[PDB]
Symmetry: D2
Subunit: 259 residues, 4 copies
Amino acid sequence: GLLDGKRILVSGIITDSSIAFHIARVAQEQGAQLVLTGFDRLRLIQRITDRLPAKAPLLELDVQNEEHLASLAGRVTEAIGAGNKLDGVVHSIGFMPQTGMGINPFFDAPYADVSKGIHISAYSYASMAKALLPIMNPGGSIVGMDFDPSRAMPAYNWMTVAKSALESVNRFVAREAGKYGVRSNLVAAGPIRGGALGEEAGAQIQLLEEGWDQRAPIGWNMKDATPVAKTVCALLSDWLPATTGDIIYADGGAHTQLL
Amino acid sequence: GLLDGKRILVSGIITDSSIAFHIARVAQEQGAQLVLTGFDRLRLIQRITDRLPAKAPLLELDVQNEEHLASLAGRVTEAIGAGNKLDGVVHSIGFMPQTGMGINPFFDAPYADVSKGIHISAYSYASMAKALLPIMNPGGSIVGMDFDPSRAMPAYNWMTVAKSALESVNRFVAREAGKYGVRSNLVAAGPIRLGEEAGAQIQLLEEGWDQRAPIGWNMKDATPVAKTVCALLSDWLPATTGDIIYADGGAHTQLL
Amino acid sequence: GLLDGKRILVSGIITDSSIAFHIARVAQEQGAQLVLTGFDRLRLIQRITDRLPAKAPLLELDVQNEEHLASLAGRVTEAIGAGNKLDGVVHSIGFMPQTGMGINPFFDAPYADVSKGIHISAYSYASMAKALLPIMNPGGSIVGMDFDPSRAMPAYNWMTVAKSALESVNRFVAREAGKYGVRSNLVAAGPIRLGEEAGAQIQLLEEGWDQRAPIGWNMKDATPVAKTVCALLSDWLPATTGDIIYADGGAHTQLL
Amino acid sequence: GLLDGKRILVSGIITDSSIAFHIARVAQEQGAQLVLTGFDRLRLIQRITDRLPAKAPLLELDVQNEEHLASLAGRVTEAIGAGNKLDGVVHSIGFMPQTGMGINPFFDAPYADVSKGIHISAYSYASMAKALLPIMNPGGSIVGMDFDPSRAMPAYNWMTVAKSALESVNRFVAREAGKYGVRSNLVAAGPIRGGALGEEAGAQIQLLEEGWDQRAPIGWNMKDATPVAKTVCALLSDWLPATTGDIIYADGGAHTQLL
């Protein structure tokens, strides 16, 4: 029971392929009690969440909706019971419009699209922390999902810029979370899975993603989300108690090897 | 004549203390022909720019105005003459509303404010490169101003997030600029220069810089930073792009 | 039982304050079966190791002794039993002579001293991996102790150079270890604990750590670091290799 | 005249292909007065150095020879004249025995070989600074050659570890050099140029080296040392006056791009 008795909020479950779905599954298997969120279409999200090992309250959260943010802590408290607080929070919501990510030239993304992406992918990490830290226990852990943006790459374009901004936001969130005895960290995952993108972009992406398994000293299996879900659970646990403002790489070691 | 015969656009001149003012001054001393940009307060900008060593056209540019951007190359070409292109572009226009930077708690910055800051401080780097690459010469150089955002610091708050975003933007700009034979780099400067708390915090931050810097850091002197930018505008760093050059007295290399 | 059924070799236990002592303690509490190494002073080492929660074989290992290295796997196999392999290896053996670390000016360290330090602190990481990989199980984990050398600091001097070298070594070890399904990672710890100058310098360094760390840093408590090592020894970081995990209270993420 | 009137010591000239040869050539073209060093075989090194644009004293320097180090400043002073000091020093000596670099497995390099490599490639940066800082002018510049060791790579093996150690040494040298108003920096160059290595290693190296031109947004021409020589001259000049303990990349921007 790695997370026995811990209460964890998990955002970002959209399908049973979502990385958040696997995080939730592994966390329940390890004894956690979960609270889940969804932006919209909650009857649809409930159908997916019913397939987790155990029941979990589902709460509405559109991170661009100020009222949802303002009521969130109260609604969680009602879900988990007065006097109870959260031990963990998982942010697995990243979004960039297609104009900012994919086939579109980098210069052709209008700022309104980039700003929406940054709002959902990076600013919301702070918004969630603001809402939830007042109901988190000392020793608790906020974990966000990242994809290493240290170097530019084809196609990821402004989503890479959004991840760069998330990395910086995480460092500031850690300062605020520290006042509660709470850690804030990101997990930088390898790619988890182009005909839709067309031939050029699809080949470029496939090369990019396959370099990962080539570089990773222990390999990288893009079809298996479990190693990333386990890492997140490690950070949610008591076993990384001195790590905050940081990035943990769940990428097969690929980012440490040039070729 | 480090920049003899180069035509260079310089944004961000607001006072004669602005870093862009010194960059302009030094570039003119080294033989560059400049074009300057401003948003609004053009009478006040003209008075300042009159203190530079040589004349330079002033053009209007609000980076949030899509029409300014869409007309900018044409307006630059008219200023420098048809058949002439730019060799350099300097982006020195960072901004964050006070809700995102200073005394305001990090969590109390609304997104509208942050988004404005990121627009002006980071996205505009890309917008200016989109507008100006088609009128730049091969061997040219685009340089933006940074303040190392690798670690969180008190008070700089969301402006540090904006500089993180700018660093990422620079790497993508480099890819685009490369197609024109143009380099894109940032210069990460040391600090150049209320209430008791914020004032003490900022003073401690600024004092630690000179302490850590192996060659010292003089916050009152922008010249070393201006020289560094002119180095990146020259032909002497011809294989450096998508990158960050630190003009900070080596402070970022030292722990204590 | 985080490490239930795992067999783990732990080097570097010298006193009951040693970080390796706590790593051993915590790993035993979490169900691991340990093998311990020491060089010399074995009577003194046995007394310390008797204070651990459970018994563990002690083996001789001077990492500069090629014969110890060449016999080490066989000696480990004899200790754990034929048909059993290791799941984990902990390297906690840094050393630099005083000429390279402390009060001595950086330039006054002779190379013979530095080279000894690098041998023990960095090369031995590779030597131990060479010796022990052939008797490790897939899914295993090799962990070494680091102290973030990304920036220069007073007094740590050539020991910081040695840790830089160790970080590079770790990335190459990872490549080799991968062929066996084994991970290789370092844990960069915060400081765990003469004359006036050196004493003040070291105190300032140590005090700044707790100030910068968003969750604080208690230099008197090795447990958080020991837990982190045990996390890397477990099955819960199964995709992390060639890497550095910081157990420093987040201090390295914060400027002031 | 970028370096007009500057006195610069340049180590590492072995052939007219050496990067130090190009640095020296470009520095002379820009008005510098040079002092050159060689380990051994000075009549041979003189033949190469005679092909530079201008005459330059050649002094003996084996960086593993303590006596050479102890006499070096005096011998330079005699070469450049009493009262004169150096404005610049270029360290372009890197060496690793074949057991540490190339075909040999990483684990098969004996420490005696690794230590010799680290002595020549990394410790000597400090030894040279120790000898020469007492005869360097404020505003001066010590520059070493680097090859980015942030990530592991095939074949470079322990030479990458030596460069990692050099990077750390540079940060400490900068502290000491700062007391004289002198800067210390490294230039991380792209690869400048496998049948000898055999088929596997030769293919691996060729792929590694060719990825560079693919990733570099402005390209990378491995046959042209001039862009690297110019960068070094930039750091030797007055135009990077606030940069120390640092690494400047002359690599076509390759290290900033993933694919």
